[PDB]
Design a protein around this ligand. Sequence first.
Ligand SMILES: O=c1cccccc1O
Ligand SMILES: [Cu+2]
Ligand SMILES: [Cu+2]
Ligand SMILES: [Ho]
Lengths: 136, 391
Amino acid sequence: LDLPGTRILNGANWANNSATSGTLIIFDQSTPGQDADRWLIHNYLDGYKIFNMGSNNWASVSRGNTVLGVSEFDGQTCKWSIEYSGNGEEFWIRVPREGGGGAVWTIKPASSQGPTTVFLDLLKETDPNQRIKFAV
Amino acid sequence: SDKKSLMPLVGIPGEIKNRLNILDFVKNDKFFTLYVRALQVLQARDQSDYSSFFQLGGIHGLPYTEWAKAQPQLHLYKANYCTHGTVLFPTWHRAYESTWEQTLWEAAGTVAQRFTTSDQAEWIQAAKDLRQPFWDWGYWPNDPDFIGLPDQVIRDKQVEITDYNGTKIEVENPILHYKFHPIEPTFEGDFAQWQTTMRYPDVQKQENIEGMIAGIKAAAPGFREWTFNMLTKNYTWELFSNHGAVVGAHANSLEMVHNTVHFLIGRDPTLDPLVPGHMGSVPHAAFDPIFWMHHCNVDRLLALWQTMNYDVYVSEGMNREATMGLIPGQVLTEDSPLEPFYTKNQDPWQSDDLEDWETLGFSYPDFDPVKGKSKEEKSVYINDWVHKHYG
Ligand SMILES: O=c1cccccc1O
Ligand SMILES: [Cu+2]
Ligand SMILES: [Cu+2]
Ligand SMILES: [Ho]
């Protein structure tokens, strides 16, 4: 009867996060531990909060323009906007900013040769590395 | 921030008044005149007007445009507003029904002013006391000759009302069909070929009204049995509200029973291949005036179940299909937004807000005898009334 949550995908690669600061949100095609690839997205205020069923970590804005998982919920860094991209079933996850224009999730490696984690850059409507689809 | 909605959902102000059974409703000469007239006004209104029959009907499914929004979005997700097969099914349609009802009410108010007879005080009073009627498709009085829908709803091409100077007049039945002006450009296939809403179409793409009526009668005992089960066999919200992830998994739910009623007006099940009418299809359904009567009884049956299973409400469930307000792959709770419906304070309506149905300005005859009593007393009495009525 338990909820399955969802998979946060980028193309074919799915999002995952392990326990243990603030851990990285790795986008690949191999799940590290149980439920590391399942996310629960509830509405939060006028945005959304994102929770990992495997590590119990929240997707957070972290000092240094990266998206890490954190243990304790923090409303200043754990709320997100999820806006439709305009094509397919692809979405932008967005840092809620005064009136809009906030930085969006970007799936690219840190300094090349992987691993492909989540970062924060300005939205480029054509950039495939920013498109996010969800699958239950 | 500012205004998000040009037409907030507020319901009906003043005294709480009942949504009546359609069979008794049509016998009320004043209520029926007002309904038909109000309906005439909404249907005549420009289809770009967000307070028109088309726009209000067009919220449910097609077209995929924003309804009464002050500012457009950058990238609009083209999909249905209505949530089907999720925990938010009965609650969303409560909001949807009242959105309709407040527009019908506000239109009828201006009609009652037009009357020039001496009994206009009784007209002005009837206009506020007006509500959307329901169709009790679960009550079969043990009569194979019985139909829960009067002739003014499913047969009459012309209905009798009272003109503003007391004279009886015949007018085109606005409850029977709705004429598009024009046909929606995004309507594809068969629905791009119908100038009016169509019920129970035959092989030659035309209405089979007599075949529709035979089919309702023949399933009327089977629906008594099914409604009775649905109300007294479901004890959790999950099994009562949605038909299930794989359609046909929750046979007992309100939605699943509610589904087969849509096809009774909309779809002949013996045809190969299927030729659905408007009511037989989700993205076109809410253009048929009978939709509001069917969904008034859905809201009624939800209210009856609520009385029995009190303080048992929206439970968390997944949202698999993307609607125009709901993200694909998110969780849905009592706090989840019911687009495109907004409160007088410009907040998205939530299930939580509309749990107590009277907050929207209506009740149901069933609840007259237990007014003021406790949840427990209303619980006992109604569970007897369901047993007396649908048993
Ligand atoms: O109108 C409908 C038609 C077909 C199937 C499911 C649900 C509906 O609400
Ligand atoms: Cu619906
Ligand atoms: Cu329906
Ligand atoms: Ho709420």
